[PDB]
Amino acid sequence: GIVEQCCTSICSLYQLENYCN
Amino acid sequence: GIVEQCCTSICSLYQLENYCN
Amino acid sequence: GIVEQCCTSICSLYQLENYCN
Amino acid sequence: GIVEQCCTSICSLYQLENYCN
Amino acid sequence: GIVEQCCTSICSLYQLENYCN
Amino acid sequence: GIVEQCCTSICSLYQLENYCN
Amino acid sequence: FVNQHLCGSHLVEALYLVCGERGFFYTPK
Amino acid sequence: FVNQHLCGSHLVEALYLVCGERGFFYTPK
Amino acid sequence: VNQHLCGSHLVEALYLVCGERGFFYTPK
Amino acid sequence: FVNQHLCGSHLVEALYLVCGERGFFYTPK
Amino acid sequence: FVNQHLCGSHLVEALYLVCGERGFFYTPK
Amino acid sequence: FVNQHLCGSHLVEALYLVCGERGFFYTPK
Ligand SMILES: Oc1cccc(O)c1
Ligand SMILES: Oc1cccc(O)c1
Ligand SMILES: Oc1cccc(O)c1
Ligand SMILES: Oc1cccc(O)c1
Ligand SMILES: Oc1cccc(O)c1
Ligand SMILES: Oc1cccc(O)c1
Ligand SMILES: Oc1cccc(O)c1
Numbered sequence: 001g002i003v004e005q006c007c008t009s010i011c012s013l014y015q016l017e018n019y020c021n
Numbered sequence: 022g023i024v025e026q027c028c029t030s031i032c033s034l035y036q037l038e039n040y041c042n
Numbered sequence: 043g044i045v046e047q048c049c050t051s052i053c054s055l056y057q058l059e060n061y062c063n
Numbered sequence: 064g065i066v067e068q069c070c071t072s073i074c075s076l077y078q079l080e081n082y083c084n
Numbered sequence: 085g086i087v088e089q090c091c092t093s094i095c096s097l098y099q100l101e102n103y104c105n
Numbered sequence: 106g107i108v109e110q111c112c113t114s115i116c117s118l119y120q121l122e123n124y125c126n
Numbered sequence: 127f128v129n130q131h132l133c134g135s136h137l138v139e140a141l142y143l144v145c146g147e148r149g150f151f152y153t154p155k
Numbered sequence: 156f157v158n159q160h161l162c163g164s165h166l167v168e169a170l171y172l173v174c175g176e177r178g179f180f181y182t183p184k
Numbered sequence: 185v186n187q188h189l190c191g192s193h194l195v196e197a198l199y200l201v202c203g204e205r206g207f208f209y210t211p212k
Numbered sequence: 213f214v215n216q217h218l219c220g221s222h223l224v225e226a227l228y229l230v231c232g233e234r235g236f237f238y239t240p241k
Numbered sequence: 242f243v244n245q246h247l248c249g250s251h252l253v254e255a256l257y258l259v260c261g262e263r264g265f266f267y268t269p270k
Numbered sequence: 271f272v273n274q275h276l277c278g279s280h281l282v283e284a285l286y287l288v289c290g291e292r293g294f295f296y297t298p299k
């Protein structure tokens with residue numbers, strides 16, 4: 001999930017863009 | 022929308038729960 | 043205290059309400 | 064209260080210290 | 085560096101002032 | 106300054122990037 | 127409008143605390 | 156009253172940093 | 185508690201990255 | 213300890229939202 | 242004045258996020 | 271865990287408050 005993926009290591013803006021509508 | 026409803030007047034936590042999944 | 047209780051485990055908003063005056 | 068005093072004009076850190084325990 | 089200096093032990097506001105322009 | 110430019114109109118993250126080191 | 131931008135930033139943080147595990151969809155317009 | 160709601164959010168974060176171990180009382184009354 | 189704190193920063197980063205597009209936050 | 217310092221910062225924001233008009237007292241000690 | 246104070250608070254957080262490793266200088270005046 | 275990143279987020283907010291009109295510099299390296 002997003003926490004599993006982004007709280008262990010830092011997510012870039014590209015990875016975060018994945019969640020935009 | 023949530024903006025029109027909650028940025029013009031304060032929404033309580035109960036009103037905000039309306040927007041949860 | 044609140045720190046001992048809510049920083050070691052997650053406090054729900056219901057639990058936090060106890061610290062309101 | 065603190066809101067009237069500090070949401071109209073900016074309160075310095077010294078002024079905010081007035082509200083510490 | 086600020087990160088090495090303030091992310092294990094808490095830096096007081098007094099110490100943080102060293103990083104102001 | 107950045108305040109004059111970005112507190113009147115919303116600056117996108119692309120525009121803000123111009124202020125990075 | 128910056129005032130709406132700033133208000134929405136606080137709205138998302140409130141939704142995060144209220145919704146918890148349920149999560150939420152945030153749609154401006 | 157939303158401007159005041161947003162302001163208070165920042166006020167408590169400033170009080171937290173300024174007061175440190177002393178703690179603080181927030182009473183918007 | 186670490187994940188809860190991280191999640192708070194995540195929604196804020198999502199808000200800024202997604203802009204008027206909005207976003208979907210689903211931890212479960 | 214910075215981890216407690218950071219946790220306290222979020223706790224204060226949660227208290228602000230849940231307590232509303234009532235206000236609250238933050239005394240970590 | 243207060244509106245700008247609050248706006249700046251969010252501005253620095255956006256700068257921290259977009260600038261990442263590079264860092265940044267924040268000069269309001 | 272992303273501890274340094276979260277720490278930085280809070281340092282930037284404290285620096286904004288502390289430094290005021292002088293502004294500040296943030297270099298994570
Ligand atoms: O991986 C993360 C976690 C929190 C904020 C962020 O920008 C990135
Ligand atoms: O009406 C609102 C607007 C922003 C945050 C919040 O908790 C409520
Ligand atoms: O247990 C906690 C700690 C920090 C914020 C929060 O909402 C709950
Ligand atoms: O204590 C509260 C207040 C408002 C909403 C909620 O879920 C809990
Ligand atoms: O007057 C104010 C209002 C909000 C935060 C702050 O540091 C000062
Ligand atoms: O040492 C620190 C780290 C983060 C915020 C702060 O006010 C102090
Ligand atoms: O124009 C702005 C002002 C404040 C925060 C932000 O992300 C953009």
Ligand SMILES: Oc1cccc(O)c1
Pocket residue numbers: 185186189214215218273274276277
């Ligand atoms: O639980 C946490 C959160 C942020 C920084 C840290 O060192 C620990």
Ligand SMILES: [Cl-]
Pocket residue numbers: 132133161162247248
């Ligand atoms: Cl604001």
Ligand SMILES: [Cl-]
Pocket residue numbers: 189190218219276277
């Ligand atoms: Cl944190």
Ligand code: NA
Pocket residue numbers: 271272273274
């Ligand atoms: Na780490």
Ligand SMILES: [Zn+2]
Pocket residue numbers: 132136161164165247250251
């Ligand atoms: Zn704000």
Ligand SMILES: [Zn+2]
Pocket residue numbers: 189193218221222276279280
């Ligand atoms: Zn945090």
